[PDB]
Design a binder for this molecule. Structure first.
Ligand SMILES: NC(=O)c1ccc[n+]([C@@H]2O[C@H](COP(=O)([O-])OP(=O)(O)OC[C@H]3O[C@@H](n4cnc5c(N)ncnc54)[C@H](OP(=O)(O)O)[C@@H]3O)[C@@H](O)[C@H]2O)c1
Ligand SMILES: NC(=O)c1ccc[n+]([C@@H]2O[C@H](COP(=O)([O-])OP(=O)(O)OC[C@H]3O[C@@H](n4cnc5c(N)ncnc54)[C@H](OP(=O)(O)O)[C@@H]3O)[C@@H](O)[C@H]2O)c1
Lengths: 263, 263
């Protein structure tokens, strides 16, 4: 079984490297043929990862992992014509709820990525975690069985909706405040901010209820507790659009999204 | 004040949900340690601390014992330090006939509908948060106390109904798979299902002798639902069968093997 990983980024390289250690035919595809300096962890022996451009690949793949930014997806899709066949499993290694409908293939699955890493130039440094949460089906089980030996942790989900939406809420809270406030997590020291955070979470959590998921105020409590231990259109934009889809009243979400739209 | 003894699957689950509303709820075990709790599988992990008997210094108004039936006697001597004379003790166990072992005024058997498992120091809750208790002044007071938690307290007019119903449910499926040393997959044999019915009719005959309205329809529902603590479940029913001088051939045959295993 052949595997391709579109997107030579922090997530893409980390996945591509770990799969090449199990199934070496795993191909990392980018826009240009380049070489990426990769660290499995900080202070690890530097490794060169082969990145082959679209023009270099001549074969179709059974499993394609798209790990580009959510606003970069539309640029990747046209290349799926020659990169994929009819029954190719397409996995979106992206944040938020990706544009699943934009991809004209039968087997398209949204993945919840929990892989922390950064890219500076062509030097990718991985920090921790190798987890990918995907919807449980026959092909995602086959892909799970294939990456048995790799430390890539594939978590098959009965309903990936709950996994997707939970991370949506997590990013909704702390990342919106840190971005708009232009500070670290220490901005949560302000009592007014913490109130906003819960209200912001409750807004998104209210949208999650409308989508049919079992998220209550206790979900907010657990997420707020997580914050004590430390792509807008696809994240906040998605929660916002579904808030209008159900004609909901989410003022805190509306305000955050209004400023994030203004960059 | 509420204290839960036994940091297992049930004990931790009750502890977690009550601590959300009643922060001073104390989870008590043999020794101090940390339990890794999951509200549901694949949910974010949450730590919950446990105090040992040596660490607990005060008495509690309400105590919830959530240990195995065969582990109750080891808990009993500690109750003279963790409780006062007016303390309500709730026995969150399966089976029956163990309320007499607890030397206190307010002892109530709880029909526990809280599913989950404990692997090492990791508790994974599955579904439901229901406790069924006999209705009285103290339980009514306990129900309103935990009204803000999602612990479902169902106050029954006559708890003997729910206790024995759960007894029969345990009697039918456990006994066969336990004696046959196989999974639920053993129920595919026509002889086994017929036997499973006859075993239930035996237990139903014991329940009828105890003054319950159980009939051939009660068995039919359990057979439809179908589509160690043995001394407190099969052992209890067998004991009461002798008390009423009943002829329960299927119950005797099963229990004699289960009893022998334990020796
Ligand atoms: N810690 C994390 O980074 C983290 C954690 C959890 C989830 N995620 C999510 O996972 C996804 C991966 O993000 P990331 O951190 O890998 O971002 P990143 O490091 O910037 O990855 C983007 C990479 O894709 C390449 N690329 C861009 N457009 C392309 C195209 N049309 N065709 C082929 N390759 C293209 C870029 O190459 P150039 O360098 O030439 O632009 C860049 O190397 C993100 O959506 C993120 O939200 C990330
Ligand atoms: N799905 C379910 O779990 C489920 C569903 C319905 C009903 N029930 C009923 O609920 C009851 C609770 O079972 P469970 O699932 O919680 O089993 P469990 O997970 O094994 O709980 C037993 C816990 O009690 C602790 N313990 C044992 N002896 C003790 C002592 N002397 N002092 C203090 N703590 C002690 C044990 O800790 P260590 O082992 O670490 O010492 C263990 O963690 C059972 O009788 C069961 O029939 C269970």
């Amino acid at each position: 079984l052949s595997v391709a990983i579109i997107g030579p980024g922090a997530v893409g390289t980390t996945i591509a490297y770990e799969l090449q250690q199990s199934l070496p035919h795993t191909t990392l595809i980018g826009r240009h043929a380049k070489t990426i300096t990769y660290y499995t962890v900080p202070h690890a022996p530097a490794q060169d990862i082969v990145v082959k451009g679209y023009e270099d690949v001549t074969n179709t793949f059974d499993v394609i992992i798209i790990a580009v930014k959510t606003h970069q997806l539309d640029a990747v899709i046209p290349h799926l014509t020659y990169l994929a066949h009819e029954d190719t499993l397409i996995i979106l290694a992206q944040n938020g709820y990706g544009q699943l409908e934009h991809i004209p293939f039968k087997n398209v699955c949204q993945a919840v990525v929990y892989i922390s890493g950064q890219k500076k130039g062509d030097v990718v440094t991985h920090f921790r975690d190798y987890q990918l949460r995907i919807q449980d089906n026959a092909l995602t089980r086959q892909f799970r069985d294939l990456v048995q030996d790799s430390q890539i942790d594939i978590v098959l989900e009965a309903n990936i909706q709950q996994a997707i939406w939970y991370k949506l809420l997590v990013n909704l809270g702390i990342n919106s405040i840190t971005l708009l406030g232009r500070q670290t997590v220490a901005i949560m020291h302000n009592p007014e901010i913490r109130i906003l955070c819960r209200q912001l979470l409750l807004d998104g959590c209210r949208v999650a209820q409308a989508e049919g998921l079992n998220f209550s105020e206790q979900t907010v409590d657990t997420i707020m507790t997580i914050y004590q231990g430390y792509e807008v259109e696809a994240i906040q934009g998605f929660i916002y659009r579904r808030a209008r889809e159900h004609n909901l009243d989410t003022p805190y979400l509306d305000t955050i999204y209004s400023f994030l739209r203004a960059y």
